[PDB]
């Protein structure tokens, strides 16, 4: 509810290092798709082919993303909502692109509500889709959402790993 874009720039250096999801082998979600429209927290100078620094606090336009692919960037620190220093909300930089607009998010936008709706809706809809329809057998969502709910509710598992 409460989460809103309060600030332009929190002035933080913080952020999470995203790798390309190579769960198993196949590039499940390419780096580019996972990272597009995010602010780069920190450059990475690898001398390379296209001479890319890409400076701090740059929103990844499709341009800069294409350059990443040519250069074969391994993993990248990207500014994130969680690592924002803004108290009572987040900054436009740590969020990045308003995906619905195709550019940097405007301060004032109620991001939280958008987030919750976006995450919730597919579950709620797919619970109607492959069930009015879901007929023959060759699971689905009824198994998945309990897993998701157990995550967001931070329930400790029945037999946990030790660290």
């Amino acid at each position: 509810q409460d989460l809103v874009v309060t600030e332009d720039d929190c002035g933080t250096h913080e952020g999470i290092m995203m790798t390309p999801v190579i769960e198993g082998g196949d590039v499940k979600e390419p780096l580019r798709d996972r990272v597009l429209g995010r602010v780069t927290a920190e450059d990475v100078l690898k001398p390379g082919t296209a001479d890319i620094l890409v400076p701090r606090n740059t929103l990844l336009h499709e341009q800069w993303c294409d350059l990443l692919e040519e250069n074969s960037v391994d993993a990248v620190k990207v500014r994130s909502v969680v690592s924002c220093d803004t108290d009572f909300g987040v900054c436009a930089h740590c969020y990045g692109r308003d995906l619905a607009r195709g550019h940097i998010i405007n301060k004032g936008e109620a991001i939280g509500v958008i987030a919750a709706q976006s995450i919730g809706e597919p579950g709620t809809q797919l619970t109607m889709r492959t069930f009015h329809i879901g007929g023959a057998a060759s699971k689905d969502i009824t198994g998945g959402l309990p897993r998701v709910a157990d995550l967001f509710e931070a329930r400790r598992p029945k037999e946990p790993a030790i660290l």
Partner: protein, 50 residues
Amino acid sequence: RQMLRKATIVNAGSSDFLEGEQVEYSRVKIANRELEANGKVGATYSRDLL
């Protein structure tokens, strides 16, 4: 991020926080900016997941 809103303080600050109170991380970091300025007893805390 919304899940990580709160933090349990383990050790007294210059305020009336003291052991075991759980306060919003925003408010205790803003307090720490003022502690940095004024010195005094710093507040040792630990962020909690909810």
